[PDB]
Design a protein around this ligand. Structure first.
Ligand SMILES: [Mg+2]
Ligand SMILES: [Mg+2]
Length: 150
RNA sequence: AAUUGAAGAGUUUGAUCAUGGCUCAGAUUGAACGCUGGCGGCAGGCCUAACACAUGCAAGUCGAACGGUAACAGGAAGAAG
């Protein structure tokens, strides 16, 4: 259950006396299929170095998520920079419908049957991220009683 | 048992994030044109000039309301082929 996938890879330019010096960037997501997900950025002058350097970053920076079966307890909202995202339990029809990009975090992270949608900018670095934070804030379907109870 | 269902992409920049229009993948059609065209079932077929119209047909029927015989069908005292 290693499970990992990169979401977006990109080129960027730096500009010096002698011209443009380019380089790449990688955005990755890793999860165990049972909660726990992280993302990593990491950039590098060549692609495989960039994705490698990323998968790593993702290994740490990993948070976990109070799932509830294969789905989410309550419908959650997330938002970071321009990306404002929303996903919903969905008493699984089949489920797992989202914009490949946050399907990526969902998938690996173990959620099996949601419906999701991203608003604002589809800028991956911020949507995958608005989502993680999304699932993170999402609170425990009983440690809400822990919360109250008293 | 019986609406239990929601995805994003391209494009301003050297590059970036934001803002923001343009564009694209989808469904839908009483459709047209271009190329092509085998058979069948159901359906659809002037969206325009409420423009103008040759010709046929689209409202009759009842002799058990009525006087009726002009047509054709028979029959009739009786005149005959
Ligand atoms: Mg340019
Ligand atoms: Mg032809």
């Amino acid at each position: 259950e290693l499970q990992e996938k990169l979401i977006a890879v990109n080129r960027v330019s730096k500009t010096v006396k002698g011209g443009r010096i380019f380089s790449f960037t990688a955005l990755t997501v890793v999860g165990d299929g049972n909660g726990r997900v992280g993302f990593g950025y990491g950039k590098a002058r060549e692609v495989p170095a960039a994705i490698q350097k990323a998968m790593e970053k993702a290994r740490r920076n990993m948070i976990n998520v109070a799932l509830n079966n294969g789905t989410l307890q309550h419908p959650v909202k997330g938002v970071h920079t321009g990306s404002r995202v929303f996903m919903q339990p969905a008493s699984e029809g089949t489920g797992i419908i989202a914009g490949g990009a946050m399907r990526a975090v969902l998938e690996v992270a173990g959620v099996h049957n949601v419906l999701a949608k991203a608003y604002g900018s589809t800028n991956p670095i911020n949507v995958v991220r608005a989502t993680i934070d999304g699932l993170e804030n999402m609170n425990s379907p009983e440690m809400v009683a822990a919360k109250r109870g008293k």
